[PDB]
Amino acid sequence: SRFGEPLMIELSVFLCLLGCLVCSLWFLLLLVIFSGMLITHWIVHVAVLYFTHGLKTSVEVFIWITVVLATWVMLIQTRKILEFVTWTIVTVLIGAFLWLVKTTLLKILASSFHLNRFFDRIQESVFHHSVLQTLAGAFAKWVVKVYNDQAALKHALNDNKTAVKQLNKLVTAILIVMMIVIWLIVTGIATTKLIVLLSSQLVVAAFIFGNTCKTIFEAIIFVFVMHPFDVGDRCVIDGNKMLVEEMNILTTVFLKWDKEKVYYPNSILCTKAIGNFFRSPDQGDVLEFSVDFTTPVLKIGDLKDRIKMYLEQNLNFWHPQHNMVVKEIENVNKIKMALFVNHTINFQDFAEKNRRRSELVLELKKIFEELDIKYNLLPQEISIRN
Amino acid sequence: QDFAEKNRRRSELVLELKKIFEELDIKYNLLPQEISIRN
Amino acid sequence: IVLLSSQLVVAAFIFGNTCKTIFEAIIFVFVMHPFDVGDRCVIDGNKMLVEEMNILTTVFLKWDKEKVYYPNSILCTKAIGNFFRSPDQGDVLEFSVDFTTP
Amino acid sequence: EMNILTTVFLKWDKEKVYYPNSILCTKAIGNFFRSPDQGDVLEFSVDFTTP
Amino acid sequence: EMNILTTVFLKWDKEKVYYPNSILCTKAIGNFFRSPDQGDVLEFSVDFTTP
Amino acid sequence: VKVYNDQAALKHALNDNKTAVKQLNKLVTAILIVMMIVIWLIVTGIATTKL
Ligand SMILES: CCCCCCCCCCCCCCCC(=O)O
Ligand SMILES: CCCCCCCCCCCCCCCC(=O)O
Ligand SMILES: CCCCCCCCCCCCCCCC(=O)O
Ligand SMILES: CCCCCCCCCCCCCCCC(=O)O
């Protein structure tokens, strides 16, 4: 596991000049320009940071084609051949448009997923590594924590890139297919019988792949929009405290307290209430106990006072705020009580939580012995027959 | 809305009930058990 | 125009159910409006403080401050208690005494 | 209170509860207000040997 | 064995069990083979007066 | 003889994890054949439009 483990190449400038040289008069000059008009788009782009760098090339294609179609329209059985060509160009532009849309949406999703959530953890990681580099020119525990946190960020970053690439493949594939169909029908190539068969194929597919498409969509919303947890977070699902090992579109992989690896479908996880200790504020806890009904109220008062002193001597572990609650009188034999305390940590480090609680439980033991707090069973009257 | 406060007030009432039972000598006892001994 | 409309129909067929869910969540948040941020609510016996409200999810803190994310698509079908909006509340102390108590 | 989408109830300890009509309408609902005089039961036990 | 419609498993007592994949598709599945070294717990109790 | 018996055991151990693929192949092929029948009927013009 990742967590829990024990020459032509640069001839474009020249090519562009050669293309310009192609005409100096007349009507076909725009058509000729199209052959190397990409250079013009590149220059326009130069003339025109995450989105900018990632999208400029998609924009260039879109506008490039738009111009080619516009000049084509204004340029002019060759009669039917040209109708065909015109529509082919239109289809190509539609394709580029959709391409641009697709790219944009994935860039938004991919970026906002992390940029608006853990920017600050990245900066903390950089800081600590700068410090380690400087130092080189409980210390060891600190050093290990710094490396483990960096690894966690690397894993989150890689899983996001992967998930987005998977989305990219699904969308690209459907986009390509629909563009083929669009081309065939707008150009007039497909005939009535072909339209009928394509129509049927789509309808049938709509049923077959219906649940699949819905499931993927819901999984995307769960993972990227709701985002109840990240990689490495300790989460609670139906009472199971589990560490998130990996996130994917269809599944989330978790490690149980005993490090069993669990594959948990997102289509199920989407309907559950999910806890997240990593994202929690300092967490609290409870120690329940019972005392005899005859315990003097003064000993109850001494118990409260002794507990307060303990907690105040250990402020690295406990917040000063606590409550002692008397809850119930059972028969006239038992008083049920509970101690409510506040930890100075959240529970991402579960073992540390238990160690601190364990000491508090032993302190309670000690206080009861010193104050002579006891619990007795009710007496039983016996009658003897011979 | 404030649970800690609710419980503090309730705890005092529970301890008052304790006090009243002691002052009025109110008790609970288990049913007697008859034993036959065959040695 | 026809081709565009045709695909909207197909998309509806396939994703209409997720859109339905989002819409239902909108009605829960803005029309039913069972709670606000900072209120203590009771869901399935769990007394939780509302920390954040969103369209798709509600974030709550449990008594031990564990942060919990509930889909609104689930809260829409539950009965929700709200202590903030409640009038003065009552309580019970149960006990038992000997039969022979005068 | 009553509304179209949800009914609001108070429990015996007066917490206020929002209860969707979409779930409430599939439950059997008792109504004490509309009820006739109601009955009750005291259960108890005695020794077998009681004459 | 694995097939498209069903998965065949052996229980600890080697009973052969046939699961529809359509139901496994909705379950959380543990996999020991793929797991890192696993941990364990021994629970016990002692007298309160143990020093 | 041990070498050949071990070779056989290994070939089976490896082939046992590919049974789902073989099943998918049969399914895909059946679909593909049907698609080609339909294509033949249409591309040669033998089918008419009412049918
Ligand atoms: C259902 C159509 C495919 C869905 C999109 C591609 C896969 C999305 C990611 C899900 C996890 C699959 C890849 C990891 C498998 C593994 O554990 O080796
Ligand atoms: C009719 C549905 C179409 C829109 C599909 C996109 C998903 C709905 C809008 C998401 C709004 C943000 C939800 C809260 C996210 C958060 O928990 O921070
Ligand atoms: C999908 C549309 C839902 C809106 C139509 C129903 C109108 C609201 C019904 C009452 C429930 C909300 C209470 C609002 C307060 C009020 O106006 O009395
Ligand atoms: C060709 C369509 C048949 C309908 C059933 C769909 C699955 C294709 C057939 C592959 C076999 C599925 C597993 C059954 C167990 C076995 O083969 O022994």
Numbering used by the authors:
A (entry chain A): 96 to 101, 186 to 204, 222 to 244, 258 to 285, 294 to 354, 503 to 751
B (entry chain G): 713 to 751
C (entry chain G): 560 to 661
D (entry chain F), E (entry chain B): 611 to 661
F (entry chain B): 509 to 559
What does the study report here?
Flycatcher1 (FLYC1), a MscS homolog, has recently been identified as a candidate mechanosensitive (MS) ion channel involved in Venus flytrap prey recognition. FLYC1 is an ortholog of prokaryotic MS ion channel MscS (mechanosensitive ion channel of small conductance), which functions as an osmotic release valve, and is perhaps the most extensively studied MS channel. FLYC1 comprises a homoheptamer with six TMs (TM1–TM6) per protomer and intracellular N and C termini. A glycine-containing hinge (G575) splits TM6 into two halves (TM6a and TM6b), and the β-rich C-termini of the FLYC1 protomers come together to form a hollow cytoplasmic cage.
A composite map was obtained from merging the C1 reconstruction and focused classification maps in a 6 up to 1 down protomer ratio, based on visible density from the C1 reconstruction. Topologically unique cytoplasmic flanking regions can adopt ‘up’ or ‘down’ conformations, making the channel asymmetric. Based on the composite ‘6 up 1 down’ model, we carried out additional MD simulations in the presence of negative membrane potentials of −450, −225, and −112.5 mV. The pore radius at the start is ~10% wider for the composite model at 3.1 Å radius, compared to the ‘all-up’ model. We also note that the pore constriction geometry across these three simulations is more well-preserved when the composite model was used. The wider pore constriction is accompanied by an increased number of chloride ion crossing events over the same simulation timescale, with a conductance estimation much closer to the electrophysiological measurements of the stretch-activated currents. Our MD simulations support the idea of passage of chloride in an ‘all-up’ state at −425 mV and a ‘6 up 1 down’ state at −450 mV, with the latter exhibiting an estimated conductance closer to electrophysiology measurements. Our observation that the channel adopts asymmetric assemblies with protomers adopting either up or down states is likely to add further complexity to the FLYC1 gating mechanism.
